[PDB]
Amino acid sequence: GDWSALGKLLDKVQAYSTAGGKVWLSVLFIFRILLLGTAVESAWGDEQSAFRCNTQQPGCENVCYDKSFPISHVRFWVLQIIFVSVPTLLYLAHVFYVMRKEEKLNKKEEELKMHLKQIEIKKFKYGIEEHGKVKMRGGLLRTYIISILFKSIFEVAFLLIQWYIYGFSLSAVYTCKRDPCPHQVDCFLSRPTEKTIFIIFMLVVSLVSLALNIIELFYVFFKGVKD
Amino acid sequence: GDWSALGKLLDKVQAYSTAGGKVWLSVLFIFRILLLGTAVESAWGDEQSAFRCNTQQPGCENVCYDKSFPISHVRFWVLQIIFVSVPTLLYLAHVFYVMRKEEKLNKKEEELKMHLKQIEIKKFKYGIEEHGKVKMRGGLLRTYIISILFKSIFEVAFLLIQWYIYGFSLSAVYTCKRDPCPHQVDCFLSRPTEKTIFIIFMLVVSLVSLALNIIELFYVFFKGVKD
Numbered sequence: 132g133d134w135s136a137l138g139k140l141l142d143k144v145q146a147y148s149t150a151g152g153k154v155w156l157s158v159l160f161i162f163r164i165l166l167l168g169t170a171v172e173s174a175w176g177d178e179q180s181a182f183r184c185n186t187q188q189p190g191c192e193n194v195c196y197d198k199s200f201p202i203s204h205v206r207f208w209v210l211q212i213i214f215v216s217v218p219t220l221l222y223l224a225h226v227f228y229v230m231r232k233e234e235k236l237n238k239k240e241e242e243l244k245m246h247l248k249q250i251e252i253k254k255f256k257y258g259i260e261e262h263g264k265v266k267m268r269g270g271l272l273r274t275y276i277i278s279i280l281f282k283s284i285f286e287v288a289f290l291l292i293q294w295y296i297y298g299f300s301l302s303a304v305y306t307c308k309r310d311p312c313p314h315q316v317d318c319f320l321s322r323p324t325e326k327t328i329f330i331i332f333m334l335v336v337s338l339v340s341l342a343l344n345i346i347e348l349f350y351v352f353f354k355g356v357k358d
Numbered sequence: 359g360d361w362s363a364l365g366k367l368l369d370k371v372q373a374y375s376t377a378g379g380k381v382w383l384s385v386l387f388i389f390r391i392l393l394l395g396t397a398v399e400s401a402w403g404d405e406q407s408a409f410r411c412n413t414q415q416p417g418c419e420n421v422c423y424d425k426s427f428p429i430s431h432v433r434f435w436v437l438q439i440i441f442v443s444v445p446t447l448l449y450l451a452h453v454f455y456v457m458r459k460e461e462k463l464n465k466k467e468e469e470l471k472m473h474l475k476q477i478e479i480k481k482f483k484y485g486i487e488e489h490g491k492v493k494m495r496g497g498l499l500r501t502y503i504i505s506i507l508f509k510s511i512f513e514v515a516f517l518l519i520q521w522y523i524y525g526f527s528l529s530a531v532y533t534c535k536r537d538p539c540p541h542q543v544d545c546f547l548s549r550p551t552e553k554t555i556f557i558i559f560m561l562v563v564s565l566v567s568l569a570l571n572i573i574e575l576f577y578v579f580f581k582g583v584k585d
């Protein structure tokens with residue numbers, strides 16, 4: 132694949148994050164990315180060539196396959212993985228902006244050495260005191276919360292879309308009724324059992340990730356209330 | 359074919375018959391027998407090999423053909439021709455019995471030459487006077503009438519059966535729904551137009567024959583009333 136850039140960026144962002152965020156990144160790296168690339172994507176290797184129908188009408192097989200699978204599961208999961216990673220990058224960008232502000236303020240104070248008072252109050256407001264121990268307060272906390280909410284809503288929306296379109300199982304026999312197939316025809320899928328097992332596994336993984344980020348949000352809210 | 363024996367017997371029986379009976383025998387020989395043997399039977403030469411359906415399920419073609427054609431038209435017409443010829447043979451047998459009685463009575467009278475009175479009354483009762491001019495009176499008339507009625511009822515029964523089973527036309531496309539064919543399949547006949555034309559022609563011929571024998575019955579009833 133080509134997941135090198137996204138993996139590198141996630142490795143860059145995982146340095147400064149909460150424990151729940153680190154666990155979420157770890158499970159995303161292990162189960163969502165590694166498992167799909169290694170063995171899951173090989174199952175959908177001949178979902179088109181092994182598909183066949185019980186007719187001799189030309190062109191009915193392509194129409195029935197297009198009717199049966201509007202979009203492959205592997206591509207759907209890739210799109211989901213892409214769409215549940217942007218807000219972390221947004222948080223990384225905001226952290227880098229905070230770092231730039233810290234560097235400029237440090238340069239100004241080094242130049243200086245009531246200005247000290249305002250420099251210190253600005254360094255405390257952004258949570259930059261130890262030169263490498265950026266804390267979450269004011270803006271970073273807001274960005275983190277909105278990122279968590281966006282990730283959760285994207286995941287639940289994708290789950291609902293998948294539930295509406297396909298369901299959570301693949302029957303061994305599919306009934307096709309569309310031109311130019313005369314009347315109704317019978318078509319047979321390929322590897323229904325493995326696909327059902329992997330779909331259930333991915334559903335479980337998605338639910339676990341949802342619960343994990345919910346726990347992370349609750350913990351960060353409690354930490355904010357602590358102050 | 360093997361119609362030689364029946365044709366010979368009909369040639370034997372046509373010697374002594376009414377004009378309507380002779381015309382009926384002529385039309386039966388010309389249109390019913392000659393036409394069917396010459397060209398009509400060749401049309402149903404590949405009604406099985408040219409039949410095909412739009413499926414690749416093994417054994418569906420035979421089942422659909424058996425569903426479509428319970429009995430071929432040619433065999434039905436042959437059976438009809440056979441079943442609308444027996445009563446003429448029965449009349450021929452009765453005429454031969456009358457001839458035997460005439461020969462025995464002639465032998466007895468030649469032996470003799472009040473007995474003359476009874477011989478003459480028996481020769482008049484059976485209508486045997488001129489030694490070769492047998493007339494219809496008493497028993498022959500009854501046999502002729504019952505033969506005509508039996509022929510008419512057989513013909514109308516066969517016509518009704520054909521109307522109930524097939525109809526009077528063959529559509530170019532037939533819909534088949536029977537195991538092991540999955541759902542419904544489309545099957546295509548062979549030479550629908552020629553078969554429809556010949557079916558209509560045979561129906562017209564049968565109606566003409568029915569009208570002819572009705573006219574013959576009316577004429578013979580009038581002749582009987584004449585006495």
Ligand SMILES: CCCCCCCC(=O)OC[C@H](COP(=O)(O)O[C@@H]1[C@H](O)[C@H](O)[C@@H](OP(=O)(O)O)[C@H](OP(=O)(O)O)[C@H]1O)OC(=O)CCCCCCC
Nearest residue numbers: 148149150151152154264265266267346347350351353354
């Ligand atoms: C049931 C758990 C409920 C809490 C779950 C909390 C989340 C969880 O499960 O792991 C993350 C957590 C915090 O780790 P993290 O390094 O971020 O935080 C440490 C500590 O918990 C305080 O946050 C700070 O020290 P102190 O306290 O001011 O001296 C300081 O962090 P910070 O403030 O400078 O950033 C750290 O010493 O790890 C723990 O071991 C918590 C202690 C209890 C671990 C044992 C379980 C009670």
Ligand SMILES: CCCCCCCC(=O)OC[C@H](COP(=O)(O)O[C@@H]1[C@H](O)[C@H](O)[C@@H](OP(=O)(O)O)[C@H](OP(=O)(O)O)[C@H]1O)OC(=O)CCCCCCC
Nearest residue numbers: 375376377378379381491492493494573574577578580581
């Ligand atoms: C509209 C027709 C209505 C009648 C249709 C009648 C049926 C029809 O169309 O053809 C058969 C018919 C009878 O022929 P067939 O030879 O059986 O009978 C002749 C005749 O008609 C009488 O029956 C008898 O003679 P006669 O009269 O006693 O001297 C004698 O027969 P039979 O008694 O010994 O067995 C015969 O001379 O032929 C005709 O030419 C009828 C005369 C009219 C022909 C012209 C048309 C009027």
